[PDB]
Amino acid sequence: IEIGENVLLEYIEENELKKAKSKAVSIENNELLIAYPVDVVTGRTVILHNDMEVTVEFVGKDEVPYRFISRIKGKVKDKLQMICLEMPPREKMKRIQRRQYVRTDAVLDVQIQPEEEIRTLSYNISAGGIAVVLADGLSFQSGESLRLIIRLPEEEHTRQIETEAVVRRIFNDPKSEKRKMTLEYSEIAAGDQQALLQYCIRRQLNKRR
Ligand SMILES: Nc1nc2c(ncn2[C@@H]2O[C@@H]3COP(=O)(O)O[C@H]4[C@@H](O)[C@H](n5cnc6c(=O)[nH]c(N)nc65)O[C@@H]4COP(=O)(O)O[C@H]3[C@H]2O)c(=O)[nH]1
Ligand SMILES: Nc1nc2c(ncn2[C@@H]2O[C@@H]3COP(=O)(O)O[C@H]4[C@@H](O)[C@H](n5cnc6c(=O)[nH]c(N)nc65)O[C@@H]4COP(=O)(O)O[C@H]3[C@H]2O)c(=O)[nH]1
């Protein structure tokens, strides 16, 4: 559970599966109150018809994602229109895991090249994707295929991993006002990917104690 966190809904309206993003207000007794149901892609608000079985997703205080089916109990009026969601038990609230590959926060040398060539740094990495800090002026696009070269330092032997990856998303970090960008490996060698895989596990393992 948490408060103020994002509550992601997934319902069926007019035979197609629509998703929406709301905000946790309170979880009094067995009822969850969410506010401002806006569409996941459309910034404009939406309407959740009562008694509609929805599928609620959220990230708890343990940085673990949770998913449960529920129902629109009804509207609640106190100063705004908030939607009442019937909460399940504490069982029947399945913890999910959407990442195929284990991620680790590592500042690695990344070289992006589509005009010239951009040598930059990553801020987290995975065996299937990468997230990289951009400088101002760099113009890319979600869906553009880029060739990037990753300097993976597997101890003394510095492995150079060359892949092609497609831009997932570009956003502005509210903590640094610097552009960040994420990519998914379009094509990566089996040898390099396995090494990159064992690197992220050991690196994540080396900080448990
Ligand atoms: N579309 C998309 N967005 C991404 C992805 N990775 C990160 N983000 C965005 O970045 C936020 C912070 O992620 P984080 O620092 O890894 O911190 C995350 C992460 O540590 C944890 N978490 C959430 N879902 C998963 C998961 O499926 N697997 C794992 N291992 N951790 C998760 O909860 C934190 C909060 O996640 P959110 O509230 O979702 O907020 C996420 C999400 O909005 C991605 O692969 N796809
Ligand atoms: N290192 C790194 N790699 C990134 C990031 N964003 C995307 N990627 C790469 O791109 C793949 C596709 O992510 P997606 O299309 O957002 O699709 C995502 C998203 O829909 C969902 N997902 C995973 N983690 C999160 C999360 O933390 N928050 C949310 N909201 N969704 C997530 O599962 C899919 C992720 O599958 P993956 O095995 O993670 O595979 C990811 C990952 O390899 C990032 O911030 N850092």
Swiss-Prot record:
Q: What is this protein called?
A: Uncharacterized protein YpfA
InterPro entries registered for this protein in UniProt: PilZ_domain (IPR009875), T3SS_YcgR_PilZN (IPR009926)
Q: Which residues form the PilZ domain?
A: 97-200
Domain of life of the organism encoding this protein: Bacteria
List the molecular function annotations (GO) for this entry.
cyclic-di-GMP binding
Kindly list the organism's lineage: Bacteria, Bacillati, Bacillota, Bacilli, Bacillales
A UniProt-annotated Pfam family: PilZ
- According to the record, the signal peptide region is none
